[PDB]
Nucleic acid binder design. Structure first.
Ligand SMILES: NC(=O)c1ccc[n+]([C@@H]2C[C@H](COP(=O)(O)OP(=O)(O)OC[C@H]3O[C@@H](n4cnc5c(N)ncnc54)[C@H](O)[C@@H]3O)[C@@H](O)[C@H]2O)c1
Length: 208
DNA sequence: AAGAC
């Protein structure tokens, strides 16, 4: 029975991602990622996206494996103007923190009723890579590090200190340079042309 | 290209 670590090694996973509005980035680089619950209790300021939290876990931080939830991400970029960024996170989070693993969006009826304890552990992690996820047939050519369903989600039930953030992606040079001046020990990356295959792209295009 | 109920 493979461990989470052995799955990461075997599939060549190198990145977890979390998209967020640039308005949140100072707070995140200072204090780490925190759940909506934990943000409320510390009276910290945040711009959140989800009004509903149908997942039912406002004490969880939501990540992606290898590629953002491009669908949900694009939606919220349309609804909220200004610069969005993408945090890249050490895959170590998956074993070092209290994670649940969901093969599709964690708010989906297909998964959200299951005993949360069954969604922890290497068995649930491996299901992100199944040949069929609730009707999505995994493409034979999809590289091993990608989830079958682009909306596959990691719910992290504790804070993620800023040291687990390995880089941040910006939509323009000036955003990256602003945050680099503030956090000179950190890696701040950017795209010069967004007419390109970028982490802001739909995945089918990115991998095309 | 626009989640989830
Ligand atoms: N953000 C993602 O990459 C992502 C990925 C996969 C799924 N989701 C789903 C969408 C939904 C949660 O929506 P989401 O948009 O993430 O809202 P949310 O309810 O978690 O809102 C929290 C917001 O606060 C932000 N935040 C975290 N730590 C801090 C901090 N220290 N200072 C300031 N802000 C902070 C975080 O980036 C996010 O925008 C769940 O149902 C998930 O299942 C989101």
């Amino acid at each position: 029975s493979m461990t989470i670590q052995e799955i990461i090694q075997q599939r060549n996973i190198r990145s977890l991602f979390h998209f967020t509005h640039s308005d949140n980035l100072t707070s995140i680089l200072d204090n780490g990622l925190m759940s909506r619950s934990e943000l409320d209790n510390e009276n910290n300021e945040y711009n959140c996206n989800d009004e509903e939290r149908i997942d039912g876990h406002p004490d969880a931080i939501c990540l992606s494996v290898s590629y953002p939830n491009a669908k949900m991400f694009y939606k919220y970029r349309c609804l909220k103007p200004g610069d969005w960024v993408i945090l890249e996170i050490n895959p170590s989070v998956l074993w070092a923190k209290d994670c649940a693993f969901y093969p599709t969006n964690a708010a989906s009826n297909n998964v959200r009723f299951i005993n949360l304890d069954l969604m922890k552990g290497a068995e649930a992690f491996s299901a992100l890579f199944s040949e069929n996820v609730f009707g999505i047939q995994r493409d034979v050519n999809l590289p091993s590090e990608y989830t079958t369903d682009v909306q596959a989600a990691i719910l992290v039930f504790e804070k993620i200190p800023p040291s687990y953030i390995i880089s941040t992606f910006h939509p323009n040079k000036e955003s990256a340079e602003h945050f680099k001046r503030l956090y000179p020990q950190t890696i701040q990356r950017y795209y010069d042309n967004l007419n390109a295959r970028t982490l802001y792209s739909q995945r089918h295009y990115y991998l095309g």
